């Protein structure tokens, strides 16, 4: 089983994914070198105590028993503080203060983009990720796997919808070409 959301807005279309490959939960994203244990992400997010993380996930015996093995690997590593996890993420970044601030801005403005954060208060993203984790873990109890065909999840485009993007693209390119010409002419010619 796994979970994913295609967070897309007016600015860009992106995606994320979660895996349960071995028994512990990992977060996967194409921009990062490889997947990371979710507890590292939680500690990087701004919550430290393991009690609070388990509280966010749940308190029922089976849900926590299954979430159990997702934190001993974090315990094995020396990640107990926020900047430890930030350092670890900055170590695991891929490119097409880098060690800390780059990781912070990446995690703030690219992970689950549709969830807003303005003053670096990360509680909302914490809650959203926690509920997603609970969703995926409880999905194993009963095989009611979501069916993509259900017509509540379909949306229809139209002529005036499509044409708007095309006009926006053309207008932006027009302005850019004019900008280039204006820059080229005045200082030299």
């Amino acid at each position: 089983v796994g979970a994913s959301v295609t967070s897309s807005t007016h600015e860009k279309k992106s995606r994320t994914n979660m895996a349960v490959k071995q028994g512990r939960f990992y977060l996967r994203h194409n921009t990062l070198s490889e997947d990371i244990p979710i507890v590292i992400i939680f500690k990087a997010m701004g919550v430290e105590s393991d009690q609070e993380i388990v509280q966010m996930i749940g308190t029922e015996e089976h849900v926590m028993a299954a979430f159990g093995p997702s934190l001993e690997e974090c315990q094995k590593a020396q990640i107990f503080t926020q900047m430890q996890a930030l350092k670890y993420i900055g170590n695991k970044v891929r490119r097409q203060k880098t060690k800390i601030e780059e990781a912070r801005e990446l995690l703030a403005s690219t992970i689950l983009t549709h969830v807003p954060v303005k003053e670096f208060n990360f509680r909302a993203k914490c809650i959203y990720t926690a509920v997603m984790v609970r969703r995926v873990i409880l999905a194993q109890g009963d095989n009611k796997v979501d069916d993509r065909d259900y017509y509540g999840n379909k949306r229809l485009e139209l002529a005036g919808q499509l044409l708007s993007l095309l006009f926006e693209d053309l207008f932006k390119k027009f302005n850019s070409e004019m900008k280039k010409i204006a820059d080229q002419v005045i200082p030299k010619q």
């Binding site: 959301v5 509680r123 909302a124 809650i127 926690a130 609970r134 065909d149 017509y151 379909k154 139209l158």
Partner: protein, 295 residues
């Protein structure tokens, strides 16, 4: 005429014939009332090209302000104030808005009913939908556009809201359809919202729990499928074959057909109108431009 008209109501698909999965080709119950069960192409494209029903609407983006303004008053608690433990209780429901978390609420029934009543009165736009999911204890509110709708007649305590006096008034011209909308006599329903309703089909099937009623069941079938007489007496594939072959019958194209110069055009000398006709034939004025003859 039908070949031209039916194209304006055709839906494509983004799967674009990539491979076989035995998935989105099949007919689902979720298409009730929105897409034509019969008018689908025969052959390799079967199921992947679809046509709209007769009584259907598409929504568009909304204000998004008053919804949150009202939600903050119905008693939804901010998520930042409380810790994550509360989500595990069996009596608290998440509230979303276009998938974005908005708060947590106790006793969701009051919230849902008040929201629906407020929308009916006229303080929330008629295309905003609110629905409940008991399995996950969530409440979804959607306001973006692109999702289908259908109007239904509201039912309360086993009597339809509309009455013969309203129909007499409409016939005389005292009122119009939007008057029915404003007086809380009919309302639109989305696919997600009608998951929570009990849509009585005919008046004589109304019972304690029914909450809406069908204006006209014959509008399930689309434009091209409304030419068949007695579609419900035929085995199903024959209706699809007729839907496919009605777009090719020779006939008349329009009154200006004698002035067009087009690559290829077929006409019939002495067309005749049908002797047994549907009501969709009268809606689209097919009898003025017939294609065929009585034998």
């Amino acid at each position: 005429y039908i070949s031209a008209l039916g194209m304006m109501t055709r839906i494509s698909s983004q799967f674009e014939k990539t491979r076989k999965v035995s998935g989105p080709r099949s007919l689902q119950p979720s298409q009730w009332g929105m897409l034509c069960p019969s008018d689908t192409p025969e052959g390799e494209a079967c199921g992947l090209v679809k046509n709209l029903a007769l009584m259907t609407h598409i929504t568009t983006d909304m204000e998004d302000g008053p919804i949150v303004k009202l939600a903050s008053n119905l008693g939804v608690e901010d998520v930042n104030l409380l810790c994550g433990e509360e989500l595990s209780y069996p009596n608290v429901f998440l509230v979303f808005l276009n998938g974005n978390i908005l708060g947590v609420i106790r006793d969701h029934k009051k919230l849902v009913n008040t929201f629906r009543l407020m929308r009916r009165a006229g303080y929330i736009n008629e295309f905003v939908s609110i629905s409940t999911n008991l399995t996950d204890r969530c409440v979804y509110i959607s306001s973006d556009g692109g999702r289908l709708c259908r109007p239904y007649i509201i039912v309360k305590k086993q009597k339809p809201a509309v009455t013969n006096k309203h129909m007499e008034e409409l016939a005389q011209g005292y009122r119009n359809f939007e008057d029915f909308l404003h007086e809380s006599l009919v309302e639109y329903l989305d696919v997600n919202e009608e998951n929570d309703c009990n849509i009585a089909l005919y008046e004589h099937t109304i019972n304690k729990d029914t909450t809406h009623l069908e204006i006209e069941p014959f509008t399930l079938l689309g434009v091209c499928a409304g030419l068949i007489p007695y579609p419900h007496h035929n085995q199903s594939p024959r209706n699809t074959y007729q839907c496919a072959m009605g777009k090719q019958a020779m006939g008349t194209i329009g009154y200006n057909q004698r002035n067009r110069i087009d690559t290829l055009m077929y006409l019939l000398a002495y067309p005749q109108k049908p002797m047994v006709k549907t009501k969709t034939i009268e809606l689209i004025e097919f009898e003025k431009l017939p294609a065929g003859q009585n034998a």
